């Protein structure tokens, strides 16, 4: 492209966040193609860890196709893409996940030879109706050659997605990643669109390039609207919980508001 400057190129590209039954797909605006992105399959009700998956969105396509199958209503897809006129060929994406029953160890992923981290995030999870009690998110760190995610809070699976770039790419040093876990625990269906919040903040003197916020929920099929891109050049990205709870009798659905951004120096 005419601009060789990673903060500017990433800010000017269009973000798209899509929710629906998996695998699904998210489409770039007409005339644009994928630069980077991810597709998730998530299910925070059914047992086990097979229903958690992240894959990268390959560049240069008009859409990003998702992953996983719609076996129950509680299976959901969440797809995030950044679209522009052409790919940034210096970017390479990496995903990793732990095997079933190998979640007690630290997950590690490395950038391809001679590249370094632009950004990304890792998540740890557990299945079952209470499994969001073990949810965590950690950002990857710009300028490293690796990203890792460690188990915590009783989690049984780790997964991560990151973007890497040639080490000399202009402007890389101006970028910083932030991930946040906000309100989490039992959901409250009487807090009208006000069931806790997440507030992902840039460090002082930086503003948002891209990112997203999401409500994770036992019943993901009822919080599809709670998945949104983060606003360019804002100081923070915020979202409230919807206030949804399909638990029977005395049982509460669980939720977790979380997000991830890349910020750039102002
Ligand atoms: Na943008
Ligand atoms: Na579904």
Numbering used by the authors: 820 to 1085
Quote from the publication.
Efficient egress by T. gondii critically relies on micronemal secretion of TgPLP1, a member of the membrane attack complex/perforin (MACPF) protein family. The CTD includes the apicomplexan specific APCβ domain, which consists of 3 direct repeats with 4 highly conserved cysteines in each repeat and a C-terminal tail (CTT) that includes a basic patch.
Despite using a construct that encompassed the entire CTD, the resulting crystals contained only the APCβ domain. The TgPLP1 APCβ domain crystallized in the C121 space group with two monomers in the asymmetric unit. The structure was solved using iodine soaks and single-wavelength anomalous dispersion and subsequently refined to 1.13 Å resolution. Each of the three subdomains contains an internal antiparallel β-sheet and an outer β-hairpin. Subdomain 3 (S2C Fig blue), however, aligns less well with subdomain 1 (RMSD 3.207 Å) and subdomain 2 (RMSD 3.175 Å), with the majority of the alignment differences attributed to two loops that protrude from the “bottom” of subdomain 3. Given the hydrophobic character of the loop at the bottom of the APCβ structure we reasoned that this loop has the potential to insert into the membrane upon binding. Thus, we conclude that the tryptophan located at the tip of the protruding hydrophobic loop is probably responsible for changes in the fluorescence spectra reported here.
